[PDB]
Write an enzyme that holds these catalytic residues in place. Structure first.
Site, PDB file in Angstrom:
ATOM      1  NE  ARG A 184      94.000 -24.841  41.098  1.00  0.00           N
ATOM      2  CZ  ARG A 184      93.052 -24.422  41.629  1.00  0.00           C
ATOM      3  NH1 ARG A 184      93.263 -23.801  42.820  1.00  0.00           N
ATOM      4  NH2 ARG A 184      91.671 -24.754  41.234  1.00  0.00           N
ATOM      5  CB  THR A 185      94.094 -31.047  39.719  1.00  0.00           C
ATOM      6  OG1 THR A 185      93.857 -29.800  39.024  1.00  0.00           O
ATOM      7  CG2 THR A 185      93.240 -32.085  38.966  1.00  0.00           C
ATOM      8  N   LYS A 220     116.309 -42.706  32.598  1.00  0.00           N
ATOM      9  CA  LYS A 220     116.158 -44.103  32.365  1.00  0.00           C
ATOM     10  C   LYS A 220     115.300 -44.603  31.177  1.00  0.00           C
ATOM     11  NE  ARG A 278      97.997 -30.754  35.526  1.00  0.00           N
ATOM     12  CZ  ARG A 278      97.131 -29.700  35.459  1.00  0.00           C
ATOM     13  NH1 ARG A 278      96.011 -30.184  36.011  1.00  0.00           N
ATOM     14  NH2 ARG A 278      97.408 -28.455  34.937  1.00  0.00           N
ATOM     15  CG  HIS A 283      89.717 -28.233  30.390  1.00  0.00           C
ATOM     16  ND1 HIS A 283      90.559 -27.798  29.255  1.00  0.00           N
ATOM     17  CD2 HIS A 283      88.433 -27.701  30.470  1.00  0.00           C
ATOM     18  CE1 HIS A 283      89.815 -26.850  28.774  1.00  0.00           C
ATOM     19  NE2 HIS A 283      88.520 -26.791  29.289  1.00  0.00           N
TER      20      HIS A 283
END
Lengths: 283, 301, 301
Positions: free
Chosen positions: B53-54, B76, B97, B126
């Site tokens: 979505r974002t 790693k 994000r 947000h």
């Protein structure tokens, strides 16, 4: 006008022939003189709900060759909501989804934003059929009065179905169907041909038809030896990917044309995107 | 502009003036696109946590401004600080994000002059979600003052409601209606903040009570795992919006939803003039564009 | 018209000393004067059959900085057929594949489409060696007559192999190999150095060489690669602290291919000798230079 402007392309059957010739002429013109800025300010969503790297890379290269930008994904909330959201971002939606009917469903929620189906399913793979026909027209000079053989699994080979139906819209073609008896071409297609005055025959080996064919569309494993009496213009086509049905010694022969065909995928899809998102034929 | 090379980690990092500038820039870019404002910029879309979505929205904002995008959609001896130290030498801005709260803020400590934009849509911070909510409210209502706004659903953990109420409380004359199960009421510190500023609010148990008074109906889901199955059976159909419920709704009313939805809004709402959640999502494009434009371009068009 | 045009770049050893000097001069020229539209209308495939966010983000940022478009995948039909198909779409293939032979094999089926290897195999990470060489040349002013120490796992660290082989193509370099005996520099490299009468020595600690070196190239020692009876041979002597730099030369730079774990303490980061992040950033100009030389015959800038 331009008959494809902002039209959805979900199925090959949604295209009249006049449409097919238009797409092919635009494909050929863009192949001769590229328009790398035609879609300079368009954003296209490449939504491969089902992964298919070859087809996505081809579609996205077409988009970039036309100057468009690309956002997208490979591989919850309903499909309708996903499309309802995305169609507010982008100018076109190119989508492949595992479920048949998903592309039409997306058209129900995409508003004015066109959907182009990149699926391989039964309904349609319109850009694959378009690139097949384009390769045939490029190598033979026309789509009428041709000799076309189709080899392999013809019951589940959806591109032979679509390609046969599209070729039947042109005049004077003759078909040769070579397959094991358990996987013959469906009757509804043979009847479609019967109702027109189009000639077709079944064969159990390619050797029977090898000397007369202009196109050999693959899905018995074909070797270079089998091509001894082929026409100089004969081309071996294959939608890809292949496993064993074409041996690697075919690759170096002049008849091998499956990779060039794939390359023509670029110009078929460029033509579709250009026609759907551009009003004026400044091509 | 006041936001040039600014990090956007929290909505609280923005003054009222900063916020007005972001909203005005969003309106300007919606009206007159600037498709080459960021022609020579390269932006990293770093989704350490996946969110189709974002990411599609943010990356579309990047392309609508003419920027190029490099990035990753998931995942790693590698470190976040070292990863940011490296990436901030490649690109002109970092959109990120990350599953851990505070990670974006931490990244601003190693990015040098490269601005970091927090791309979260639901944790405690947000910012672009609140910005697109506010932008949708202002576009459809003409203002962010003197509004009647109802918040429906799980208001205890619906964090976008928390951010949206706090942002609306910075404006004058707003009145809030909180519709929630009693176990999922608004956090007490927010109600206390509303009283401490003298903002009027009331509690309600169903959408019927308030439907005739509201200018904005912001919906949230109520997950069954939040409640005893007893209470959930008792109260579930009580917080689902259907077309029938809108019989006495004000003409100007808009239904908002951060998305995705499940059942809390029936599909018969989509067809009504009040359904505005998809337009809200679309306004996400212009909120995020405004952030990118102000952060990466000094002088205003 | 340049000597690398439409050439495959699969190994660093395919480049002479003169070739490296040309690539590095080109990188320096692109760093000083960006050419954001040099590769306009080019489409480049970024094929990471094996994930490597580091290198992929660097390579793709290079492509975008030159104006190219990018299609590709980061994964986790035969390879020959895949290349036969893709080379009909794109103008160059940037490739990382887990199998050592994959990049050369792809060159057999790519036609006139150049293949650039982004692998971390044995002699198959050319852009890593190029950014190392470029960083050394930028900070030291030359690639001749240097004192270069390599620290850590020199047996399985393939980038120290590449770098030692490339610096051995220049005159007068002096090498310091600081490693556990179980992870020493392989004999074939020492033999190559003896054959070009190039001087090298073994040392047990960074402190032994600190006062002489212009370059301190660090790698990590993974103790798992050792017998437990050798764990005690890896104590503090292969880890750099800020304290260790008391007697370092003014020009000395600490390099590291990354990621790092503990072998460079973070207190090194603020010191002027820390240069591993600038090095990673130079990856942009090494890769830009390669793409520019391989895809453009006449390079006017």
């Amino acid at each position: 006008a331009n008959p494809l402007y902002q039209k959805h392309i979900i199925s090959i059957n949604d295209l009249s022939r006049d449409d097919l010739n238009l797409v092919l002429a635009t494909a050929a013109k863009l192949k001769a003189n590229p328009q790398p800025e035609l879609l300079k300010h368009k954003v296209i969503a490449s939504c491969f709900f089902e992964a298919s790297t070859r087809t996505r890379l081809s579609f996205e290269t077409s988009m970039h060759r036309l100057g468009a930008s690309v956002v997208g994904f490979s591989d919850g909330e309903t499909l309708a909501d996903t499309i309802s959201v995305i169609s507010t971002y982008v100018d076109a939606i190119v989508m492949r989804h595992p479920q048949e009917g998903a592309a039409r469903l997306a058209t129900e929620f995409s508003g004015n934003v066109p959907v182009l189906n990149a699926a391989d399913a039964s309904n349609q793979h319109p850009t694959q059929t378009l690139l097949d026909l384009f390769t045939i027209q490029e190598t033979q000079g026309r789509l009428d009065n041709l000799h076309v053989a189709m080899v392999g699994d013809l019951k589940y080979g959806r591109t032979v179905h679509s390609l046969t139906q599209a070729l039947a819209k042109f005049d004077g073609n003759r078909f040769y169907f070579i397959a094991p008896d358990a996987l013959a071409m469906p009757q509804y297609i043979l009847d479609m041909l019967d109702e027109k005055g189009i000639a077709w025959s079944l064969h159990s080996s390619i050797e029977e038809v090898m000397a007369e064919v202009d196109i050999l569309y693959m899905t018995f494993v074909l070797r270079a030896s089998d091509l001894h009496n082929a026409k100089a213009n004969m081309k071996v086509l294959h939608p890809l990917p292949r496993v064993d049905e074409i041996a690697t010694d075919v690759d170096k022969t002049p008849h091998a044309w499956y990779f060039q065909q794939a390359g023509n995928g670029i110009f078929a899809r460029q033509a579709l995107l250009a026609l759907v998102l551009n009003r004026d034929l400044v091509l």
